[PDB]
Symmetry: C3
Subunit: 340 residues, 3 copies
């Protein structure tokens, strides 16, 4: 919500409180999304200052506060800064920002990351270029320097992150994206490649000096309709876990597809239908095994732009015998959202 706008600077302080509950069965160890309270809140700011006619400075920070932890030792579980970056935008020359931001491959993957609560299964956090990462320098360009309406492109430099965990680490890498939009239709292409760290190479699942991620996106978004599809493959980039052996690392290769269809009624209801499949190929010890496989049905009800409610239902197709231990049961999430 815009709380300050004077002398060229504007600050938007935003957030939400989401009451959220997942319904599955068992001890919780075999479903898609889990079971019980999943409440969470968020707080951030988005600032922008008009340096002059052509030049804008901007900054953004966003934090995730789980609401399903006790005030005891588990108090900070799942809490983190989602975004933290600052940059400059100059006329039609471009923008440049640095800090913790969305990887370039998310430029494609965002087409299908539109479900009520689930979806966007391959846009992992701290995973090279597909989700939020730390230490990325991103150059972005709109309308090809103002010459070609609807034609955008970006390049992104991923600096190495030698963390304690293989899962959360990354070496130096370059990525990019190109897209074109015209009358509701849009097409994107995005690719990234980075070195893996020693620690990543030491894990038992995954062989290669470089991680690679790419995705394609197609969509139709107008007339209250939203149809989207993404196609992508990864090499040594998708984090995987063998639940049986309890080993860990990255899948040698993944083939991933996401499909989404939604309709926005003027009365506020927005039914959603989706299909998601992610398959790991050549997993040492396993070979081909599905990571993600489901059908999705759900709806959001928008009271207005501050209040909404939803039900998100995952018809899980992963089988009970799945070679990696990936859950096979269904999950139904139900949530009430206030946002500003």
């Amino acid at each position: 919500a815009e709380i300050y706008n004077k002398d060229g600077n504007k600050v938007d302080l935003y957030g939400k409180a989401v009451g959220l509950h997942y319904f599955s069965k068992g001890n919780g160890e075999n479903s898609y999304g889990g079971n019980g309270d999943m409440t969470y809140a968020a707080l951030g700011f988005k600032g922008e200052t008009q340096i002059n006619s052509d030049l804008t400075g901007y900054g953004q920070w966003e934090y995730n506060f789980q609401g399903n932890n006790s005030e005891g030792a588990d108090a900070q579980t799942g809490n983190k800064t989602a975004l933290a970056f600052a940059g400059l935008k100059y006329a039609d020359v471009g923008s440049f920002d640095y800090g913790r931001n969305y990887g370039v491959v998310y430029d494609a993957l965002g087409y299908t990351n539109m479900l009520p609560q689930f979806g966007g299964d391959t846009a992992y956090s701290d995973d090279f270029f597909v989700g939020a990462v730390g230490g990325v320098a991103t150059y972005r360009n709109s309308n090809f320097f103002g010459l070609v309406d609807g034609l955008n492109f970006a390049v992104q430099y991923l600096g190495k992150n030698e963390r304690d965990t293989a899962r959360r680490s990354n070496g130096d890498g370059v990525g990019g994206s190109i897209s074109y939009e015209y009358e509701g239709f849009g097409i994107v292409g995005a690719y990234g490649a980075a070195d893996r760290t020693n620690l990543q190479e030491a894990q038992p699942l995954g062989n290669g000096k470089k991680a690679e991620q790419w995705a394609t996106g197609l969509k139709y978004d107008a007339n209250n309709i939203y149809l989207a599809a993404n196609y992508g493959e990864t090499r040594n980039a998708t984090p995987i876990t063998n639940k049986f052996t309890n080993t860990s690392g990255f899948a040698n290769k993944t083939q991933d597809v996401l499909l989404v269809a939604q309709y926005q009624f003027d009365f506020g209801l927005r039914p959603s239908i989706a299909y998601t499949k992610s398959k790991a190929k050549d997993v040492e010890g396993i070979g081909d095994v599905d990571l993600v496989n489901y059908f999705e049905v759900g709806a959001t009800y928008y009271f207005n732009k501050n209040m909404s409610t939803y039900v998100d239902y995952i018809i899980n197709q992963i089988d009970s015998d799945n070679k990696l231990g990936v859950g096979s049961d269904d999950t139904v999430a139900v949530g009430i959202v206030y946002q500003f």
Copy 2:
């Protein structure tokens, strides 16, 4: 403080910085409240949107930031999200919210949780229905569907929380409260019952498949006067610790009383007097032992609604030989509060 109010939505961004210091004696191990710096700050938002004439959506989030930790490894000690919930309110039909909120038994216990800094000793956090918990669905009704002025009621569903700690866990449970207010007087009744988790049952202090908490409240609140009393009992619900053996769990039963008397002078001073006693009955190995036993004297000085100061003095009656190790010394807290 209301920082945004446009197009039906309103956001109140609030908080405070409390400079706070507790004065007791020793190595700190035998007083009521402890010793040294107890500074802390808080930040939250309270949002509300007018969906239409009869329908309101709302959301609230509040965080506690201790101010007595170093910037070292103890940085997050005592930090947590106090509240995180969202809901809807419809005409005189009721309200419904879900997330981390106050348990229904706090509807009674809030009558006496009005001291300058201490008090409200049996409104434990993450303890079924007496304080803040995660995963509660609360229905609330004002004035009996608009038919009986001053007659309110609530029902609350506690979903299971199988955490790592017995202290912070809970099984499924139902609770409720009924109250009546007329001309400064008010009477409340609140009860809750939930299953205990396996981990709770495994502890050495406490036997039972269900936790039970109830409290009654009576008050007079008008003419600058505030008198309140609460009477309550718990079964397998009050967290207790044997300091000598170093065992832990919940008291088989508790009998608890709280009494409060305060006066609000027009010049800003508000003297406070209180009595609090909590007794555990049938503690395995001990039998009857007091958990809480003291007299309270204090005053708050209100410069206005943003600035205030106080002194809170606990005359501790727990004896030096207390069977559980509960401190016997006095505590004096002194604080200066800025809030917005």
Copy 3:
């Protein structure tokens, strides 16, 4: 940014998002500042209420959110409440605040803590009186009770902090500062002394029952010019580490000098030049060894008061053989800052 100002109370909600990257060489273990992403954000509030003509209440809270952590187990690394205090100010009688605030010796040390990113090397956090600490009661006076324009003074009471770490602990102590300003020139003197805790005494580096810190400050600050110098010594107060033996504690004595020269061009550029040297004397096992020794060059470019950019270059003079293991390589930081 001032987001609320009504009925005597005013709230300033402030913050920034800083994209920041340090460039050094190696595995990172031998430079001045380190290597890689150093992004971080900040959020705080500064409130003030006009109680009456002569009396003001105030409160402040500030948090540091690192932006170079993953959303994994290292999520809270470096996160903390920087400041949390409240107080009262009465006419020309003085101000008094309590909570986590800057130690009095920082009244002197702030003269040279003005570099783009580095500098202020002896204003350690949680280190008696030179940086931010918890549990300090500070009385401050401006213009000698309104009698002597430009003549200020302060006294500060440090309450004991018996933490888990020797580094972050402190005993009871008193400190003070006096300063005088006239036409761009300013001179400060500040001293503090506190008891050390048992844990501090138990460490292998440092002998003494009391910690002592003092600094002198001189500056010229007008005509777009800023020249400053600080001279100070510590006794058993500067935290030190022997990287070779892996021991820890405080230097018996330190001698510290800081020099800064900057120029603020009207077009927005502010070149900076600085010199910093800190020497430890009589370190058990070592004798005299430099802790800090470098030359600094840098510039900040101010687009306006919300956006800025900088380069900060440390020409490190510590030698490769430094007896304590203190890094000898150079560091270049580069950052883009949005603030409000």
